[PDB]
Amino acid sequence: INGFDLPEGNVTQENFVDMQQRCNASDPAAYAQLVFQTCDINAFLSEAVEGTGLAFIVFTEAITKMPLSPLW
Amino acid sequence: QNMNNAGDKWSAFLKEQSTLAQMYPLQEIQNLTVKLQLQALQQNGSSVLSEDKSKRLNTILNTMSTIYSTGKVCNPDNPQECLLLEPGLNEIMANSLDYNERLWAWESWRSEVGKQLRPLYEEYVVLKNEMARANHYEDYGDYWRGDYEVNGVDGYDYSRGQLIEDVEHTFEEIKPLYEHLHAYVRAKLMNAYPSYISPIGCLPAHLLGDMWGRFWTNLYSLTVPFGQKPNIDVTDAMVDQAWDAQRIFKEAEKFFVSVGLPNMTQGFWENSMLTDPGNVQKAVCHPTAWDLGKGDFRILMCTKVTMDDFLTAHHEMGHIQYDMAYAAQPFLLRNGANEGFHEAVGEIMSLSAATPKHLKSIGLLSPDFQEDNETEINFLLKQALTIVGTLPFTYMLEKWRWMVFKGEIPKDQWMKKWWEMKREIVGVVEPVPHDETYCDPASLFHVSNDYSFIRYYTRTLYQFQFQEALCQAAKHEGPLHKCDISNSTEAGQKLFNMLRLGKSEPWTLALENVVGAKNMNVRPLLNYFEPLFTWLKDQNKNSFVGWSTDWSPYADQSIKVRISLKSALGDKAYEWNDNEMYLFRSSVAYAMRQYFLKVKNQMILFGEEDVRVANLKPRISFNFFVTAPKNVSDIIPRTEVEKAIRMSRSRINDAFRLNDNSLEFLGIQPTLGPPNQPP
Amino acid sequence: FVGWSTDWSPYADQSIKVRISLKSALGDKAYEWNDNEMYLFRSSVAYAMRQYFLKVKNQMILFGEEDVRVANLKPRISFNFFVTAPKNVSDIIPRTEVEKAIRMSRSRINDAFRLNDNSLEFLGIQPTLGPPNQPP
Amino acid sequence: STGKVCNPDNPQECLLLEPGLNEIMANSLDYNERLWAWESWRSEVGKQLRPLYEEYVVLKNEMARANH
Ligand SMILES: *[C@@H]1O[C@H](CO)[C@@H](O[C@@H]2O[C@H](CO)[C@@H](O)[C@H](O)[C@H]2NC(C)=O)[C@H](O)[C@H]1NC(C)=O
Ligand SMILES: *[C@@H]1O[C@H](CO)[C@@H](O[C@@H]2O[C@H](CO)[C@@H](O)[C@H](O)[C@H]2NC(C)=O)[C@H](O)[C@H]1NC(C)=O
Ligand SMILES: *[C@@H]1O[C@H](CO)[C@@H](O[C@@H]2O[C@H](CO)[C@@H](O)[C@H](O)[C@H]2NC(C)=O)[C@H](O)[C@H]1NC(C)=O
Ligand SMILES: *[C@@H]1O[C@H](CO)[C@@H](O[C@@H]2O[C@H](CO)[C@@H](O)[C@H](O)[C@H]2NC(C)=O)[C@H](O)[C@H]1NC(C)=O
Ligand SMILES: *[C@@H]1O[C@H](CO)[C@@H](O[C@@H]2O[C@H](CO)[C@@H](O)[C@H](O)[C@H]2NC(C)=O)[C@H](O)[C@H]1NC(C)=O
Ligand SMILES: *[C@@H]1O[C@H](CO)[C@@H](O[C@@H]2O[C@H](CO)[C@@H](O)[C@H](O)[C@H]2NC(C)=O)[C@H](O)[C@H]1NC(C)=O
Ligand SMILES: *[C@@H]1O[C@H](CO)[C@@H](O)[C@H](O)[C@H]1NC(C)=O
Ligand SMILES: *[C@@H]1O[C@H](CO)[C@@H](O)[C@H](O)[C@H]1NC(C)=O
Ligand SMILES: *[C@@H]1O[C@H](CO)[C@@H](O)[C@H](O)[C@H]1NC(C)=O
Ligand SMILES: [Zn+2]
């Protein structure tokens, strides 16, 4: 969106991959500087933290993104 | 009205005889001569519209013609001195070497005149498309392309859609020669306007020698290859031999007899305006040839004793020799074969009379005078500034008008497509951005005065096709630009077999009577400028040849804005129309007024018209820069606009309900704020 | 009647009075009302007039800040204003249509100056809507 | 003597004061046309004269005080 000038609510999760190829077929040499991520679940669920990190760097990070943070 | 009571007597006789010609349809005529005259008489024109649509169209045409000739522009510092275009504003664009004064005259002419013409022209296009469809054409551009149409003459036919394909076919071959002329002129303009012109970009539009860049001929004093050598001029040998304005018309008359064409007509030698009276006897001096009828051929020009008035006499007498040749034709078939043949015959006469081979035998140009090969490069580059420099301009303008008339450019994209075609075809960039309130093509004469413009492209191609064919019949040996067709009767016979036809035969057949082909060709134009194309490729060894359509004169002081409405609000989110861009230009002008008051203690009355917006997108992004309040040449530097936005960023955020991450400025990042919470 | 009163004016019956209370809405953190803030006020009224003629009457009329004519400026921070046609000084927009244009964009003019509907009053335009139906 | 004022609908017809703008203010009975000529004369000319006159007053007060 910051590289191809598209509306806001344009190119959501349902239409990521088809809008990847609509841009590179529209104009080449503007897709080559784009840095994308290969992030996917079963890689975010699969960290091997154990022993003290499951309460001090994993559980307390998910508490800050809840509604009432200093009560949970 | 001694001629208006005779002219309206003639204009009414045509429309009386036009309705009588409707009784004979064209699907039963077998003879081609009587068929061609009926096509010229049966055409309806603007007599097919409604009775109040035909008078609305004539009011727009008179209004657009009056804004052009009487619209004026005055000075920011002194509003009492206003300049018209035709004196005064043309002499700035032709003679000034000041970047700031040329930019004022270029931009302020497009403003007022620009806008008026805008709505006028919109209405115009609309009305013009209705007249052409009622005459069984597709649009009005197809109506204009009907001058080149040949129908059913058994191997000489020519479509109206074939002209678009032959113009774009010949243009792709002129493109290597034009790129080396573009790259040579750009390098020489960088020594005249330093720190204004990029060595790999387009040329700024206000630096081209006239108001539109139609000709590059006024750039000769800056781009001359060998400046210490003067050009060949014989305006002083004509005075030493006391040549009046009767000997130079007798020398032109001897040039046409030498190739086999006839003399003048006694009546001609009798009546004529070959000199200016000078007293209170007034008159128009424009050089014109006249064809009054029944063997009456007259020339009217204020003839001085100069070299180019010697050349204009050869140009205008070629029009008389063309009219004298088809005088045995019917009245409706007395013209050139198309609109481009008539001005091409006149320019090969002044081309062959200006050679130093010709001048040293006429009495001028003393007989021991060997021309250098450095004055031949000086001669050819002056020709290419007028001939080659006008061909991408002429092609681009008719391509823009052909697509506007058929609807391929919508009305909200007229000015956006105009400057994309100028950066791509012509290699010329605008110095300030222009929205859809401008009508920059209509600021030219031919657009607001309803004239076709493709005749200046085809005449340039026929001119060198005729000259190369007539120099092969005259057995010329060296290069084409030194050729002279005088004293050759077998070259004046090939010309006369086309001259005597008129519109009796198709124009594809009148070419084959001279050049031996049926289509227009661009290889004789490229053979003319072949000694210059070799010299330009050696001057462009280290330079870059070509242009990039991304550089701009205002691009290094612009700031990019990015607006994310549906992330800051989501729902409860408004729609970004043109009223929100007006409020944004007012908040930037507010922020500029506050910074100059609290940091510099000056009161500068910035307005929303001083915030120039370019490159608007759906994502909601644009560039902007700020100028002085009534000085378009004075761009405020970007590092001072960054300080003014930082002072009032919280005030601009509250006016749009955005918060510093949904309104970003791309180079201005928020800095301050210590989170020192607990005591 | 013999004599004249120095209060009547040809533009006085289509004017709207504005009253601004800066030190009650903010107190401290309060800015100073110079002539640059009157320029932003004339632009927000011209913005509000452009939006009303587009969404109610479907006309595009290019109002500017020079079409908002301000009179009778005081320290308390009060003035009268009326709106004319963009380049026709004889054509005063009627007051009942300027009252409808200000009602449509009142929340947008309040946010541009950090005031909230009681420190920016228009004296004849009062806020109306809003049911407090809280509990389900 | 040389400042002029032109029409909103037709910007090509500009009137000087001494012919043309005086005959509107002396002969017209149209409220809207008299209000246009009254206000548009004060605008441009008005402003220029503004700073000019300010400077003027300043300079004129210095000549008179040096003459006691
Ligand atoms: C087409 O019609 C014209 C008449 O309008 C013919 O022209 C005549 O031709 C004859 C002999 O060729 C001459 O004697 C006449 O003087 C011509 N008429 C005029 C007015 O000059 C012409 O020949 C016809 N074309 C064909 C191919 O038959
Ligand atoms: C030129 O315009 C006329 C409109 O007046 C077209 O229509 C013809 O008009 C005449 C009356 O002058 C009628 O007798 C015909 O019957 C009309 N023709 C049709 C097809 O309706 C005329 O056709 C036009 N001519 C051309 C060559 O376009
Ligand atoms: C065309 O040819 C004629 C004759 O061939 C040239 O006239 C001669 O010109 C030279 C010098 O210009 C004189 O010495 C001769 O006496 C001339 N001959 C006659 C018979 O008068 C004429 O100059 C040629 N024209 C061009 C343009 O080359
Ligand atoms: C004009 O012709 C002369 C002579 O043919 C050219 O001068 C020579 O150019 C070559 C090419 O670089 C050099 O090696 C010679 O030293 C040059 N001769 C002299 C005496 O300097 C000249 O380049 C030609 N000019 C043009 C514009 O074509
Ligand atoms: C408009 O702004 C330009 C600045 O871009 C002014 O041009 C300057 O003019 C002075 C004298 O006229 C020169 O000494 C400067 O070198 C110019 N600046 C540049 C960058 O070349 C111009 O004077 C301004 N015009 C008006 C009417 O104020
Ligand atoms: C400026 O606005 C006034 C309205 O105040 C216009 O005056 C009207 O003009 C028409 C015809 O010209 C009359 O029928 C109306 O009665 C006038 N209105 C009033 C209230 O008297 C005037 O035409 C406008 N000027 C321009 C150039 O649009
Ligand atoms: C994204 O943009 C395309 C292009 O016009 C449009 O068709 C589509 O509706 C847009 N998606 C959303 C969610 O607005
Ligand atoms: C565009 O880029 C993607 C990513 O490498 C690539 O797979 C795709 O083939 C490109 N499109 C074209 C037309 O080459
Ligand atoms: C042209 O006229 C001259 C007289 O001025 C005459 O001598 C000459 O023979 C004429 N040309 C021809 C081809 O007869
Ligand atoms: Zn001519």
Numbering used by the authors:
A (entry chain A): 345 to 416
B (entry chain B): 60 to 738
C (entry chain D): 603 to 738
D (entry chain D): 128 to 195
From the study:
Although ACE2 is hijacked by some coronaviruses, its primary physiological role is in the maturation of angiotensin (Ang), a peptide hormone that controls vasoconstriction and blood pressure. Full-length ACE2 consists of an N-terminal PD and a C-terminal collectrin-like domain (CLD) that ends with a single transmembrane helix and a ~40-residue intracellular segment. The ACE2-B0AT1 complex exists as a dimer of heterodimers.
This immediately revealed the dimer of heterodimers’ architecture. For ACE2, side chains could be assigned to residues 19 to 768, which contain the PD (residues 19 to 615) and the CLD (residues 616 to 768), which consists of a small extracellular domain, a long linker, and the single TM helix. Homodimerization is entirely mediated by ACE2, which is sandwiched by B0AT1. Both the PD and neck domains contribute to dimerization, whereas each B0AT1 interacts with the neck and TM helix in the adjacent ACE2. Dimerization of ACE2 is mainly mediated by the neck domain, with the PD contributing a minor interface. Extensive polar interactions are mapped to the interface between the second (residues 636 to 658) and fourth (residues 708 to 717) helices of the neck domain. Ser709 and Asp713 from ACE2-A are H-bonded to Arg716′. This extensive network of polar interactions indicates stable dimer formation. The extracellular region is highly glycosylated, with seven and five glycosylation sites on each ACE2 and B0AT1 monomer, respectively. With the stabilization by B0AT1, we elucidated the structure of full-length ACE2.
